[PDB]
Each structure stands twice: as structure tokens, then as C-alpha cells.
Design a protein around this ligand. Sequence first.
Ligand SMILES: CO[C@@H]1[C@H](N(C)C(=O)c2ccccc2)C[C@H]2O[C@]1(C)n1c3ccccc3c3c4c(c5c6ccccc6n2c5c31)C(=O)NC4
Length: 342
Amino acid sequence: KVYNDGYDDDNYDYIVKNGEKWMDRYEIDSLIGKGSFGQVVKAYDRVEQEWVAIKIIKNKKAFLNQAQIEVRLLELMNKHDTEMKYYIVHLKRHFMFRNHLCLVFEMLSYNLYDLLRNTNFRGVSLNLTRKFAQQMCTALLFLATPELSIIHCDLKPENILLCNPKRSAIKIVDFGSSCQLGQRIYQYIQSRFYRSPEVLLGMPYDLAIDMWSLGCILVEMHTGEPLFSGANEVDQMNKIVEVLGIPPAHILDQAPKARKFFEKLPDGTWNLKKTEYKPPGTRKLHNILGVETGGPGGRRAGESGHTVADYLKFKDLILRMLDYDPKTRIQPYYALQHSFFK
Ligand SMILES: CO[C@@H]1[C@H](N(C)C(=O)c2ccccc2)C[C@H]2O[C@]1(C)n1c3ccccc3c3c4c(c5c6ccccc6n2c5c31)C(=O)NC4
């Protein structure tokens, strides 16, 4: 039982070895990430004299073909001149090495989930959250470039990395599972916590599903907990409704999976199917954010930049991101014009 001459394990993953030299160029330091696609390695590039992250794709057609699509999107994105591209992780180059496709990315620092973990899931300031909010909106404006029209499709704290551990600059990484506007190919998409209503109801969707994700992420960044932490899709929708109420009838009348979560009563209105929740719309975002009670858990009482006014602008922006209708849900260009960023 030997795989690819001893270089691979039984999952077609490359057996990583610390200190290994590739092509008299890359000095492999250690394994820093792992996934179904394969592995991510820290390394030093002798030619450019810089630390890089090498994503080593499994030696398997399924995963190689997926990675070739990633490479297309990244190169497509990195070609565009506009400065909005410096919120996407840079793909420096790619190559084949002992039958594994290898993507060389710039090396970034911690991810926003690490950040939350350090606070013991109590969150970061509204002032830091604003900075992240603006940069993420700018990155979405970029993905909305008509010639790109890219749906990241899986936005979450662990996919948003800091450039430098002492600055607020962030970049979105991992477009491996990244949809693109067009004919619908997929329906089970996004990570559950950040999955939009249109996806849950099996409806048409577009770039607006990333905006939904962002709304959930920003609240999470300031409280430290996920806004909608569903253990399954029923739980997920039920938690969304707690805060936002029953979705509008005109959406549910069209929703193919409306009946997974709701029933249409004889009077024509929609209610939740019974399955431990607060009534629709009664777990108010106002109170989740602690608008008038000194922020979440009162921990921001007396910190500057956390007044009622400051919280009202943030709350308003968030609600416009969590619009049930993806046609009127706020768009990136308008997000950046909001009072919360002035
Ligand atoms: C996005 O981070 C992933 C890894 N997660 C976030 C996890 O394993 C986590 C899952 C759940 C909860 C917490 C972490 C961290 C690590 O490897 C992963 C696979 N990666 C990928 C995957 C796909 C494309 C690009 C990357 C990168 C990249 C980097 C990266 C990392 C840098 C430093 C430490 C860890 C680390 N990682 C990185 C990573 C990177 O610097 N550039 C691209």
C-alpha cells in the first residue's frame, strides 16, 4: 500500500514534511490548515524573499478541477485594475508539484474567528467593527463588478483574515466553493449560521446572499456570538424569525420549501409549523446589540463611540442587510453611503 510513490497518504493528500525544499525555491515550514480540498502549508519563497501560504490540492480529479475554477476566479479578480481588489487575498502564482496542484497565496495573519476566540466570544468594539464593515462592503462592491459578478457563497469570520496582526486591514480568502451569477446549479449552499432566507426556502438567489452573510457577521463581530446559530435548517429559520418576524407572504407563496418551516392557514396567512422559541419579531436586534444598555452585556458602558446614536446607525445598516427580500436588501454601493460610515 503505497500512494503516488510514497508522497501521498490514502486520501491523496501530500505527506507534509517540515524543512522540505521544493524546486530549489520553497522552504516548507509547517501545516497551518486542512480541508476536503487538501492542505495549506506555511512556506518561505527564496526568490521573492517572503513568507507565503501554499494551498496543496489533493491528487484527485474532483478536487483539482474545483481548484482550477478557483484559480480562474482569482486571476480574473487580480487582473482588474481597480483598488477594490486589495480586499481579496492575492494569488501570486500556481504550479504542479509531484502531481498536486499548488496555489501560492500571500501570507496573512489571524482570522476574525481567532479574534472572537481571544475575547472569549465577547466581541470587538463598534469602532473596529465599522472598519471591517466598510472594507467588507468595499470588497462586495468589487465582487459586484458586472464583468465579475462573483458570489463568495460562504462568508464567515474564519474566512476573513487580517493582513497584519497590528492593523485593521482585512482580506477575504477561499473562493474554492464560490458560486457565480447565472443558471442555478446549487441549492445547498453557504454555512448554516450565515445562510440566507432565499437559500433556505429553495428560491432564486444572487449576490445579495453574501450581503445577508455580512449582516450576520458584523453583529457577531460586536457581540462575539453568532446571530443565528441553528443546529439544522428548521432551527435556523426559527431563529431568523425570532429577530425578523415571519417572512412576507409574497415570498412564501413562491418558496418551493415554504412547507419545511411554515404552514398556510385557512385565512391565507403563513405561520410557523410547530416542532422552544420566542414569538415572531420579539427577540429584538435593538436588545441584542444593547443599544440603550451599554452595548452587548453592558461591557461597552462608557467607552467612546458607543452612544445610542452610534448604535442606531449600526442597527439601521444591519437591518437593511437582513432584509427578507433580496431585491431591496441593501447593495454595496449604498451600504458605503450609510451614516454609519461618516
Ligand atoms: C482560511 O483559512 C483556513 C483555515 N481555517 C480558517 C480553519 O481551519 C478553521 C476552520 C474553522 C475554525 C477556525 C479555523 C486556517 C488556515 O488554512 C485554511 C484552510 N486556509 C485557506 C483555505 C483556502 C484558501 C486559502 C487559505 C488560507 C490562507 C492563509 C491561511 C492561514 C494563515 C495563517 C494561519 C492559518 C491559515 N490558514 C490559511 C488558509 C493565508 O495566509 N493565505 C491563505
